[PDB]
């Protein structure tokens, strides 16, 4: 599967069976920078929590940077 | 004054006395794409409204893309 | 003189060169931080409004900030 993998913005090749994901979360710099937005691939989907917004999908290049698709 | 001017991400030269600005607003595609985020320079600052978030500043390159600097 | 040269981040440059650190904002400055360029040149490079350059003359004097 092809997935986006930060810090780069180009598509990368991941092993068959992985999922592409985005993960928006607070790292050590949240009070200064706001939430980090990571794009990656993994064998399992990361976990949805009160402070973590997550997308997971199983088709090529399905994890570009998230956007709010509405006003 | 130097300001960022979309669609490019590099600093541009604007006449002395202009302000750099950011403007986040709903254009024709808001229901599909979300709010547009423009960076520009103008002689006066654009207007703050219920649907328009605006930054204005008067130093070089002071209008990069906005971020939420907190969780 | 030994300088860092991005994106390698250490190279041997001819004696008389200086190392440098260029930093500046592009439109991603709040998203990724400032742009950073490390290199070496026979003389301290000239840049423009908004760009900070620090030139130094000792080995490894331009590490990643």
């Amino acid at each position: 599967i092809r997935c986006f993998i930060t810090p780069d913005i180009t598509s990368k090749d991941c092993p068959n069976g992985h999922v592409c994901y985005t993960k928006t979360w607070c790292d050590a710099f949240c009070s200064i920078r706001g939430k980090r937005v990571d794009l990656g691939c993994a064998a399992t989907c990361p976990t949805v929590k009160t402070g973590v917004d997550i997308q997971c999908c199983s088709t090529d290049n399905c994890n570009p940077f998230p956007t709010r698709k509405r006003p | 004054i130097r300001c960022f001017i979309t669609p490019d991400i590099t600093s541009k030269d604007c006449p002395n006395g202009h302000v750099c600005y950011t403007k986040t607003w709903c254009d024709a595609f808001c229901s599909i794409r979300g709010k547009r985020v423009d960076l520009g320079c103008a002689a006066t600052c654009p207007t703050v409204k219920t649907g328009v978030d605006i930054q204005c500043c008067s130093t070089d390159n002071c209008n990069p893309f906005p971020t939420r600097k907190r969780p | 003189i030994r300088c860092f040269i991005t994106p390698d981040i250490s190279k041997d440059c001819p004696n008389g060169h200086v190392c440098y650190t260029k930093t500046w904002c592009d439109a991603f400055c709040s998203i990724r931080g400032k742009r950073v360029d490390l290199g070496c040149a026979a003389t301290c490079p000239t840049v423009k409004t908004g760009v900070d350059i620090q030139c130094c003359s000792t080995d490894n004097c331009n590490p990643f900030p």
């Binding site: 930060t6 706001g34 939430k35 990571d38 | - | 998203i31 990724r32 931080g33 400032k34 950073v36």
Partner: peptide
């Protein structure tokens, strides 16, 4: 870039 990640 200074940071090793993308921040919103």
């Amino acid at each position: 870039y200074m940071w090793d990640g993308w921040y919103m």
